[PDB]
Structures are given as C-alpha cells and as structure tokens.
Amino acid sequence: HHMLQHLNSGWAVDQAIVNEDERLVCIRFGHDYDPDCMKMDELLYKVADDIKNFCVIYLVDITEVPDFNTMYELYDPVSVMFFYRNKHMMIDLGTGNNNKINWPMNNKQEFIDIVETIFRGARKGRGLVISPKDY
Ligand SMILES: [Cl-]
Ligand SMILES: [Cl-]
Ligand SMILES: [Cl-]
Ligand SMILES: [Cl-]
C-alpha cells in the first residue's frame, strides 16, 4: 500500500496512485536518458493505446523526482511498477525480484499479456500474480 504523462513531483505520484479507482496504474521509474530506459519507453508508447481500458501509464524521472527511491529501492535505470487502488502489485517473473520489471522488454504482446494478468489478479483482490511467462 503506497504523449505519455510525466509526473514531476512526489505529490503528483501520490495523487496518480491514490485517485485511480478503475484501472491498473503503471509507473515507469527511471533514469530517462539511460538507453535501457529509452528502450522500455518505446515499448510503453507502442502498447499504451492497446491497454488504455484497463491501465494508465505514467513516467517518472527518478533523477528529478527522487521521493520513492528508498521506498522502492530504485537502483536500476528502469523499474516498471504496478499499483491497483493504492496497493503495490507483485509479479513473479521468475527473476526473484517480484516488485518490478527492471529490464527493458521489447516484445509488445508479452508486455500486454503481463499487464492484463496483473489487472485480472488485482481485480480478484490478489497482491501477487505469476507472469504468463518465466523470465
Ligand atoms: Cl507536479
Ligand atoms: Cl512534492
Ligand atoms: Cl471499477
Ligand atoms: Cl495474493
């Protein structure tokens, strides 16, 4: 329990998470200039319209907005995290870090499937889902 829209303050992040009752909130916490972050953002732009009925994506440059860097141990240049009704959703991706997707993905359908799985689990009141695919 806590163009794509950038969030420019810890207040704005809090607000985006706490105010959304219907959809999964996807936050990309990153060092925006890093190539891995840029790679992940291309993917987010490609899938955003496909998932807009069940998921809203926000971008946060953690060099500018560092407020959650200890809270979520944000050491990586890209960490995609998911929230439903103010609850941080876990995703067992087979990597042994269930808190975040912290590598650039480049398969559009694979990511969409992960977002859908998280949403569907969240809607059942689950705090953790097993990714449709082992990573
Ligand atoms: Cl702001
Ligand atoms: Cl603030
Ligand atoms: Cl609803
Ligand atoms: Cl659960």
Ligand 1 centre distance from Cα of residue 65 (Å): 10
The domain segmentation of the chain, as residue ranges, is: 1-135
Q: Residue 14 in contact with residue 67, Cβ under 8 Å? A: no
Ligand 2 centre distance from Cα of residue 99 (Å): 23
Q: Which CATH number fits domain 1-135: 2.60.40.1180, 3.40.630.30, 3.40.30.10, 3.10.20.600?
A: 3.40.30.10
Q: Resolution of this PDB entry, in A?
A: 1.7
- d(CA 7, CA 19) in angstroms, rounded, equals 14
H/E stretch holding 111 reads helix 108-123
The coordinates were experimentally obtained by: X-ray
Ligand 3 centre distance from Cα of residue 102 (Å): 28
Ligand nearest to the Cα of 8, by number: 1
Ligand 2 centre distance from Cα of residue 111 (Å): 30
Q: Residue 91 in contact with residue 131, Cβ under 8 Å? A: yes
> How is residue 130 written in tokens?
């097993």
- d(CA 74, CA 64) in angstroms, rounded, equals 13
Cα→Cα distances 23→16, 18, 122, 135, Å = 11, 11, 10, 25
